[PDB]
Each structure stands twice: as structure tokens, then as C-alpha cells.
Amino acid sequence: LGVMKGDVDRLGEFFSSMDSPSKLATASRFMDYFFKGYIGAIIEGKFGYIIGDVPSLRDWPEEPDIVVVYAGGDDFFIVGAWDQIFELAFRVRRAFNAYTGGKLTLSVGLGYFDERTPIYRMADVVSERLDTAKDEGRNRVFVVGRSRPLDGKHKLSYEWNHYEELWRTYAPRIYAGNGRLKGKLESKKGLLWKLLEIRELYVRDPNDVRWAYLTAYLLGRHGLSDLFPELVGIDTKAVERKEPQPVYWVDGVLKIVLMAVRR
Amino acid sequence: KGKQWEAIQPYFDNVVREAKNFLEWSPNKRLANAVTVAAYLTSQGLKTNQVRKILDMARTTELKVKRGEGDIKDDLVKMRYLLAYTVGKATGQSKYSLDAFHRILDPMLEVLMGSPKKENFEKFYDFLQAVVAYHKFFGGG
Amino acid sequence: WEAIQPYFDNVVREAKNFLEWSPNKRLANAVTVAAKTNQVRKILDMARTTELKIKDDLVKMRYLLAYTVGKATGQSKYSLDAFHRILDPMLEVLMGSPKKENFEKFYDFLQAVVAYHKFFG
Amino acid sequence: MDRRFYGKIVIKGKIKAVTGLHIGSQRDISEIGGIANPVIKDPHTGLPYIPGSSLKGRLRSLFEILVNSRLGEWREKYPSLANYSPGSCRPDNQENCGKFFNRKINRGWIHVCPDYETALACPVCRLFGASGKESNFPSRIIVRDAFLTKEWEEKWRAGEAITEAKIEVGIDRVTSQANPRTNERVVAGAEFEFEIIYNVENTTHWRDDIKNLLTAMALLEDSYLGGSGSRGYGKVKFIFDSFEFRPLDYYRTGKDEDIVSIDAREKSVSDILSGFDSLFSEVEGKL
Amino acid sequence: MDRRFYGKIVIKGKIKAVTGLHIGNPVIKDPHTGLPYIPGSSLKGRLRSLFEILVNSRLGEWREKYPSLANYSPGSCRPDNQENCGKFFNRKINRGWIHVCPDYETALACPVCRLFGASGKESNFPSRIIVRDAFLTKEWEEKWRAGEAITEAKIEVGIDRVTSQANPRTNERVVAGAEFEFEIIYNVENTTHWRDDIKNLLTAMALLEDSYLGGSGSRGYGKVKFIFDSFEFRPLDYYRTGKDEDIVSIDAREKSVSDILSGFDSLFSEVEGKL
RNA sequence: GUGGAAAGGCGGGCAGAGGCGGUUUGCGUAUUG
RNA sequence: CAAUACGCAAACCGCCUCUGCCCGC
Ligand SMILES: [Zn+2]
Ligand SMILES: [Zn+2]
């Protein structure tokens, strides 16, 4: 069950910009009609000119299985089929970024919970995955429960633009669509778990470079030397920026491809 | 191709012997050089089946570093002369390929007899597997 | 350069008993020892036979070792008697010795000599 | 409905790998240089071992087939074999067909009775175990992982090898094209200590349930135990150390009153030989 | 579909080499005991390769009795890169062509692949014989202990013609006369056709006594001589009672060609009553 | 004078099926010191 | 009068292609 709960950030600072009752009644109504009216037309499957292409496991159905629980005007809480809520969050954010003229942003905190789960825990964990994606940069999406080092240099939830290029690189080369994998990568779903084991060596020791050759060898034995060129080599640009290595970002982009297959 | 095998090897050999001890640098250097080690061994054949006796000799006492013994004398004896026995049994066109692989490990083995046993041989064994792993990635096995 | 080899002849005369060194001296002897393959394999492979196996064979292992230098004559005794002069002073000890132990350090010395023989040529 | 407890017949012994033994599991876990077909080895010692699933599975799959052949006449001996016919459910995708092999695991068909009442009478699943929706008969045997005997630990200490690398090749019939490979297998003659515990739940039917275990073992000595197997790589042989009864009065008190059967120098076929009434005769006195 | 089990015909015996044998320059040996030995794959993969070649010539005589021989013409897929076509050798392993029928019901009907087993894509039919390794016999275990050499060496030479340039090497062969002990167990699964597979396995053995066993073979490195000891049957009732209810077939002084020939139908007569 | 009391994350599953260490190459020839 | 001049192997072939978590709360 794919729960998402996201809200507009810095909105209380935005309504203090208005300086008359003519101006505040407008800005609190155009902001009102996005999460009231125009979020219905997104889920109905419209506006491809405005949105473009989202990180999407399969193209949008005619009658999607989405249940809008609540959507207030600053806030929303939407449940649904857990790989369409994944598609919807990048489809809500993209349409919100053109409804506003590129000025206000969302912070969507995605969770994934089983059907046998009480709702008072689903709202509890997702709202904490929200405040994880709120206190860091206020323009960033949480996607999957992900393990991190205890340094503080490594922040969890993905920036919106930073994630949607990780889908453009990693996904159309290891995933084809509709819950199946690319050519000759089937009977190698054990590989992508092993590739997420080498990410778990980066977490016990970030300083080790044991992940650099294990990345190159496992692609060698399986004959898949062409996939993942960003992961086989270290980035000297990423060391001096004190940003995570490209094996840190690969966890969330692999799991969505992996969970969309039966795994 | 082979023109990279002439230039990059002669760029790396003076850097090879000048760091003869296996405890040269635990930082990003020994992994950055190790790709260049397999970069001029790429254009050579470098078959692994003759090395399987040496690597299993490195394997069977890698557990014995790990609370097995505190003596790597009897193992590292067996690694020195068999690696000389590698050209000492196999000659030919694979000999010119295996002479360049001889000159990196033989400075590091002589450290390991008088070295620490928990340390400085792990720093060798990590440089052992860095040579093999990229060699599978450039197209050799 | 024969005197530096004769300086190594004292090192061959140094290891009178078996336990010469557990360290680099067995190699460092053998580097200077190896500084014809087909004449020795009735001791080389004969060492491989007796390792898995005893006492009555070791006399034959000493009888064949003198049978090599007693066959080849002329210019073919020089390095023959030299290579004769290394092995038997480590085999006169090993008659009354442990068999599975105490021989390994010569069994690893015997193999190390031919190893650098093919590298130097 | 009515699960009881009377003791645990413990079968202690030593598995002797007469031919090279091969099991095989995962490789390349934070590791580069291997032979790429390694027998499963536990990480704390780095020695090979026979697992329990590789022995309980092969004792099971050699006892589906014996039942599958004599399905016709054992409906009187054992009820709930009248739900079955000899054959597979493979030609028509049904989890309950008329035939015997009824449950789809992933893409293969393994006999598991669907209920507690159906599996209580079935000769296979009353011993090795069963499953279902909501009914779920659990097993009786605990086949434990077998490790090397006190002797073969020391041959790893003394310096003797335990795994060998056999090179096999494939050949074209026309151009004689050699297609080689390597296998890591256990050295032939190594010896693992197994232990098979039989949880005696009903005193009505243990004689006809120990005999079924010694039937699946006596087939395993003629068949192979895992690995390539048809080309020699199995050939395993049970060497029984001691049968022990471990009664109910043992567990409360602690007295060494457990009934020990005599199985010193006997084959697995010699226990089931005429004398099974004499080897386990004093177990009848305790019931 | 419908794997069954009636018993396991056990073919004990002793492989004899009248002429010296080679496997593979050392002959491979048992590590724990030091002795050389004839493996399993060199005796099951040798009988298959002297039976896929025998079936290749005769696709007109066996096709009336065996189905799924009509699906192949006698040939080879070595020039034409096609997996399953008219030519008889269909599987490219990596570079070699071995006849494996790609289905259960093709291999159920195939005369080779019902006996020497067959892989497949989602079919994977398994074998009916299991061929075990052959170590030394207990009277020849003791010649290793007595120092009578169980092996030997052999120096050949390779003559370049023009300069008469001798290029010698040292082969290492098992000495002629050394005797092993083999083991083939036939897993009787289908009572309709086992008259075939016992007269069909001995077919592959009889061509082997004319051919070589491992090694070079065209120079002297073969000469198997199967000395049989006793067939037994091991019925399903043998594994429940544990009796000596296994029907002994007398072949103490008989040959592979002396069982497959007249004399067959009286030996296996009590097994037919046991089916 | 305790948001407490009682509650096994587990019942069923052989890393298995197929695969020849292989093919050719004559312990020899050439002349003298 | 009897031998010594020299050769201890070269090659290619190195894994393959099928399967990869269900059931029940
Ligand atoms: Zn059942
Ligand atoms: Zn076939």
C-alpha cells in the first residue's frame, strides 16, 4: 500500500507577502484550487504537454486505482496502488511546478506499507519520513527506507531534479517497462541483490574503496560490463565536494525497479 | 591497443619499484594504481589457471590469518618460489606477459616474511584482489 | 664469478644439519645455487614419490644421486659434483630423522632450486 | 487435533563420502578469486559440510517415488492415498489434480498434502512434513547439519587438503572440440557426522515410520547425494554410531535411562533386515 | 510426467586394461589415497559418444521402434548455426555439438536420451544410469603398498621431417595390466522398455571394447576389457524387507558381447517375472 | 501500589539437470675428436 | 682409441544454459 503525504513548504511566509484583502483572498484561492480541483484532473490522466515524462513503471491507466483521502490546500494525503502513487508524486510535483511559476515547491514523503497495517502507524511513519524530507532542503522527495552512515554528510531523501535524472540514466538500461527487465538480464535478479550488497559495504565503512573493484568484477563475470559505468570508477569530483559517492544514490533507483518485478 | 601497453607500462614501472613495501598507502592511491596495473596487463593474455594454485595458497591461509595461526612463514615461503616457478614451468609468449606481473609482487612478498601478520598482508591481499577484479572488467579471465 | 659461487659454497657447507632457516635463507641459498633439467628428474620426481609415502627407498634416493655423477664423465662432472655437494650433506642427516616433518624444509628447498633454474636459464 | 509426545529416537552416525561429494551454493560474497563452483562452507571454520536441507530433500525425493509406484496397494495400509493416482499434475495447471504430485513451488511439482487430516495418514507427509492453507501438518524428523568427524578436523590441521579440483571437458562428436570446466568437490573419502532425530508423537505408528526412514536411506546409498551425481559425484554411505531412544522420563529427571540400540558395524540395509523386530525390541517395552 | 520406480539393476564388475591406459602430463589420481582412478564422467561421457555416433548412422532401422528419430536427419549443425533443425546434433554447448533432445517427451521417445539423460528449457529429463568412479581393486591396492609400480612413464618423440628435428615429450600412462572396479546402476522406471536399455547399454560397452577409453587411444592408450561379476536386480521390495531378494545373474566368465548375444533371455528370465 | 495481563516470525522446499581432458605429433637424427 | 654434439613438449579450449519466494494468517 503506497501512502504519500506531502505539503507545500514556506507557505506561511508566502501569505505574509500579500498586503491587502484583495490580494490575500486571491492567493489563498488559487493555491486552494490546485489541491481541490486540479489534482483531480492529474489523476484522471491529463496534461501531457505540461508534465512530460515521469519516473513511471508503466503508462497511466484509464481508470487508475488511487484513493484521495485528504487534500487541504497546503497539504495532501493520498493512498493508492503503490506503484501508481510512486508515479503520481512526480506527476503532482511536475504539474505544481507549472501551476506556480516555478516559485513554490512540494516535499512528498513516500512510504510503502503492507495491507495488514493499522493506519495510525502508516500516518506516523510517513509523517516522519515527511519531516525527514522537510528539515533537509524542503524541495525533496523521500522514496524508500534507506540506510545511511552516522556521519551527517549523507542525507537520505532525494532532491526532485536530482532523482529524475537517476531515473533517466539507470532505469531505461536495466528496466524496460510493465514489470519486466531488459534483454538477457532475466535469470540475473540475484545480481541486483548482490549489487545492493556492495552498497551495504559502503555503509559499514564509507572510507573503504572495497566497493570499487567488486563493482567492476561482478559486472565482468556476468558479462554485463556495459551497465553501470558510473559505479565501476571512483569520482574525484565527488570526494572534494564532500557529497555521497555514486554507489550511495543507487539504492533507491534499484529498489523501485526491483520491487516492480516480483522479486 | 598495444601502443597503450608500451607507454602506460613504462609510466608505471618506476612508480612500481619506488613503492616496494606493501604498506605504501592505504588511501585511494593503491586502488588507482591497481587499475593501471591491469591496464598494461590487459593487452597481454594473462591466463589465471596457472595462478589458481597461488591464489588458493593465498586463500587457504587467509582463514589462518583469521585466528588460525600467527605465523605466515610456511605459506609465504610457498608463494615466493611457486611464483618464480610460474615462469619456471611456463615459458613462451606467456612468459613475456608474466614477467611484467612478476616484478610487482616479488618486491611485496619479501616484506611479508618479517611483516606483521594481522597487518600489512591484508594490505597485500587487498592489492591482490584489485589486480584480478578489474582484469575481468577489461576483458580477461 | 666463481669465487662468489665459492662464497655460496660455504653457504652450502653452512647448512650441515637440516634446520638451516625458516626465513629467507633457503630462498637466498637457492637464488645463488641456481645462478640441465633432464638429468635430475630421477631425483626431482623421485622426491615427489617419497613425499606421499620409506627408509629403504632413501638409500636408493642416495644411491641414484651418486649414480648420476658416476655416469656422466669428461666435462660432465663439474656442475654435477657441485649439485652433488649440496644435497647429500642435507641427506646424510635425514636418514635418522622424522619423515613427514623435517624433510619439508628440504622438500621445499629441492623444488626452489629448479624454480630459479628455469628463470635464470 | 491431538499432538502428543513420547520421546525422540536419535540416530547418531557418520556419513562417509565414498565418491567425491558435491553440494554447491553461492559464491563471490565479498570475494574475487575462486573456482566458481564451491561446495557450501560455513564461514566461521571455512570447512565444507552437508546441510540438513540437502539431506532431508534427497531423502524425501527418493521416497515420493517409492510411494508413487506402490500407490495402488498401500491405500489399505495407509488411508488418504485414495485421493491420488500415479503421475504428475504438470500437464494441467491444478494444485489438486487426481495425480500424486500436487503442489507447485515455483515452477516444479512437489507432493505436499493440503490438510492436517489428509497428511496424518499419508506415508510421505506424516514423516517429512506438510503445509497448506490453515491446516498445516508439521514434520517429525529433524535432520541436522552434518560437520566433519573429530578425525577429519585434524587432517585440516595437519595440512591435508579437503577439496579437489576436477577438470571435466565436453567434446563434439564431429570436430572433437574440447569444452572444459572445473569443479570443486569434497575429497573422496571425507566423513561427516550426521544426526537424525525422530520425534515420536504416536505410539501406534512409529514402527512403520522408522522403517520408512530406513527405506529412504537405503535408497540413498544406491543413489547419490546432491551434485553432478550421475557422473559419480555422490555415492554416500551411512555409518551408524548409535541409535538412542531418549524417552519421556529422560527429559524430566536426567537419569541416563535412555534406551540404546546396538548398531555398531551394521549397514543401513541391515537394520531394516529381519532383526528390526530384534534391534528395536526393547523399545516395545517402553511403548 | 509420471516418474516411477520398480528397482535398480546393478552392474558390478572390473574394468581391465590389457594395454596401458591414460586419462589426464599425469593421469589424475585420488588425492586421499594417491592411486590413479578412472572417473565417472570419462566412462559415462565415453559410452554416450560411442552411442550417439552409432545412432547417427542408423536412423532408418531404429525409427520404426523409437519415435522422435523422425525429427532429425543424420547430420551435424557445425556449419549451419541453428539450434533445432534437421541435423542430428543439436546442442551447441559452448563450442561442441552433443545430441540432447530438448524436451521430456522427445527424450522419452529418444533411444539415447532416455538412458544418458537430457537437459532442456523447462523440461530437463534426468538420466536412468548412474556411473560411479572406479578405484583400484583390493588385490591391486596392495601392489602400491608392495612397490610394484601401478603406473609408469613413456618418452615419445615428434619428428619434424626436413631437419630430422627430434622433439620429445614424456607421456605418463597407467601400466598395462592394472585393473579397476566399475559400477553402473540402471534405474528401472518404465517396465514397457527395459529389454531395450539393458541390451542398449551393452551395445555402447561393446563398441568401447573395440574402441579406446580416454587418453590418446589411437596409439595404444585404450583397450578396456569389461570383466563383469554379477548383475543383480534390487527390487522395490529389497528396500523394505532388506532381504537377499535380489536375483543374481550368472556372468562370472562372460563377456559384454556374450551377454547381449544368445544367452540373454535365460539370464534375465526371473527379472521378467518380477517386471 | 506499573497503558497492564497472556502471545515462538514459522509450517512445507536436494543448487539441481546435461557434458570423454581432448585431437595431431615415429627417443630420434646429424657429423667427427 | 670410443663416442658427444642437443631435445624435454608446442598448440586451442576454458565453463555452459536453463530456474530465482511462494503459501497461510
Ligand atoms: Zn502426503
Ligand atoms: Zn536424443
DSSP letter for each residue of A170-233: HHHHHEEETTEE-TTTTT-HHHHHHHTTGGGHHHH-SS--HHHHHHHHHHHHTT--SS-HHHHS
Q: CB of A58 within 8 A of CB of A89?
A: no
Helix (H) or strand (E) holding E230: strand E224-232
D111 carries a ligand binding annotation: yes
Distance, in Å, from the CA atom of E186 to the CA atom of E175, rounded to the nearest integer, reads 31
Say how many Å lie between the CA of residue E110 and the centre of ligand 2: 5
User: Chain E interface, mutation test: which of D172, D235, D274, most E Cβ atoms within 10 Å?
Assistant: D172
B8 and A CB contact within 8 Å: no
Looking at residue E35, its amino acid is L
Could you give the CA distance from residue C60 to residue C67 in angstroms, rounded to a whole number?
Answer: 10
Contact (CB, 8 A) for E137 and E153:
no
**Residue E97 pairs with which residues in a beta bridge?**
E92
Contacts of D36 in chain A (CB under 8 A): 221
Count: domains in chain E: 1
Bridge partners of E9?
Answer: E186
Q: Are C105 and C18 in contact (CB under 8 A)?
A: yes
Residues 220-249 of E with CB under 7 A from strand F: none
Integer angstrom CA distances of residue A156 from A6, A107, A169, A254, C93: 16, 13, 20, 15, 71
> Between β-strands E73-76 and E7-17, what pairing exists: parallel, antiparallel or unpaired?
unpaired
- Is E10 close to D222, i.e. CB distance below 8 A? yes
Annotated binding-site residue? E77: no
Instruction: Please give the Cα distance from A161 to A106 (Å, whole number).
Output: 12
Work out the burial of residue C101: count CB atoms within 10 Å of its CB; fewer than 13 is exposed, 13-18 middle, 19 or more buried: exposed
Residues with Cβ within 8 Å of residue A74, at least 6 apart in sequence: A7, A8, A11, A31, A35
Q: Do the chains A and E touch each other, judged by at least 3 C-beta pairs below 8 angstroms?
A: no
Contact, E272 vs E9, CB < 8 A? Answer: no
Contact residues for A148 (Cβ-Cβ < 8 A; gap 6+):
A154, A155, A156, A203
Q: From the CA of A140, how many Å to the C1' of F9?
A: 35
Q: How buried is residue C56: exposed, middle or buried, by Cβ count under 10 Å (0-12/13-18/19+)? A: exposed
C-alpha cell belonging to residue A32? 486552494
Distances (CA, A) of E25 to E110, E152, E227: 38, 12, 28
Question: Hey, which residues does A79 pair with through a beta bridge?
Answer: A67
Does the CA dihedral E207-E209-E215-E220 come out positive or negative?
A: negative
| B70 Cβ contact list (under 8 Å, min separation 6) | B117
Q: How far is A221 from chain D (nearest CA, A)?
A: 10
3-state DSSP call for residue B88?
helix
Q: Are E213 and E2 in contact (CB under 8 A)?
A: no
Tell whether the torsion through CA atoms of E203, E205, E210 and E214 is positive or negative: positive
**Residue C2 C-alpha, separation from nearest chain B C-alpha, in angstroms:** 24
How far apart are the C-alpha atoms of A77 and E100, rounded to whole Å?
Answer: 59
For residue C114, what is the nearest residue in chain B, using CA coordinates? B88
Which residue in chain B is spatially nearest to D156 when comparing CA positions?
B60
Residues contacting A118, CB < 8 A, separation 6+: none
* Long-range contacts of D176-181, Cβ-Cβ distance < 8 Å, separation of 24 or more: D177/E95, D177/E96, D177/E97, D178/E96, D179/E93, D179/E94, D179/E95, D179/E96
Q: What does the alpha-carbon distance between residue E145 and residue E128 come to, in Å, rounded to a whole number? A: 37
* CB within 8 Å: B63 and D46: yes
Instruction: Write out the residue range of the structural domain in which residue E168 sits.
Output: 1-275
Residue D222 CA to residue D233 CA, distance in Å, equals 13
Q: Distance (Å, rounded) from C-alpha E191 to C-alpha E275? A: 6
Instruction: Please answer yes or no on whether B88 and C27 come within 8 Å at the CB atom.
Output: no
Contact assessment for residue A200 and residue A254, using Cβ atoms and an 8 Å cutoff: no
| C-alpha cell at position C113 | 632450486
**Strand F bases contacted by the protein (CB, 7 Å):** 11-30
| D window 256-275: Cβ near strand G (< 7 A) | none
Sequence-distant (≥ 6) Cβ neighbours of residue C3 within 8 angstroms: none
Question: Which amino acid would we find at residue E127?
Answer: S
Which three-class secondary structure string do you get for chain D?
CCCCCCEEEEEEEEEEECCCCCCCCCCCCCCCCCCCCCCCECCCCCCECECCHHHHHHHHHHHHHHHHHCCCCCCCCCCCCCCCEEEECCCCCCCCCCEEECEECCCCEECCCCCHHHHCCCCCCCCCCCCCCCCCCCCCEEECCEEECHHHHHHHHHCCCCEEEEEEEEECCCCCCEEEEEEEEECCCCEEEEEEEEEECCCCCCHHHHHHHHHHHHHHCCCCCCCCCCCCCCCEEEEEEEEECCEHHHHHHCCCCCCEECCCCCCHHHHCCCCHHHHCCCCCCCC
Cell of D72: 495402488
Closest in D32, D35, D46 to B132, CB measured: D32
DSSP 8-state assignment for residue C90: G
- In whole angstroms, what separates CA A229 from the centre of its chain? 22
Which nucleotide lies closest to D39 by the C1' atom and the CA atom? F15
**What's the CA gap between A128 and C93, in Å, rounded?**
79
**C-alpha angle with apex D97: D96 to D103, nearest 5 degrees?**
45
Ligand minimally distant from the alpha carbon of residue D83: 1
C22 touches chain B (CB under 8 A): yes
Q: How far is the CA of E128 from the C1' of F25 (A)?
A: 40
Quick one: which ligand is closest to E118's CA? 2
- CA–CA dist D190, B50 (Å, integer): 27
Q: Closest by alpha carbon to D182, among D27, D17, D15?
A: D27
The resolution of the experimental structure, rounded to one decimal in Å, is: 3.6
* A197 Cβ within 7 A of any nucleic strand G atom: no
Residue E47: CB atoms within 10 Å: 22
Find, in chain C, the residue whose alpha carbon is nearest to that of B113.
Answer: C23
Pairs across B and D, CB distance < 8 A: 16
Determine if strand G comes within 7 Å of the CB of A191.
Answer: yes
- Helix B73-89 and helix C25-33, axial crossing angle in degrees, nearest 10: 20
Please enumerate in sequence order all residues whose Cβ is within 8 A of that of B99, keeping only pairs 6 or more positions apart, or say none. B87
Rg (alpha carbons) of chain A, rounded to whole number? 20
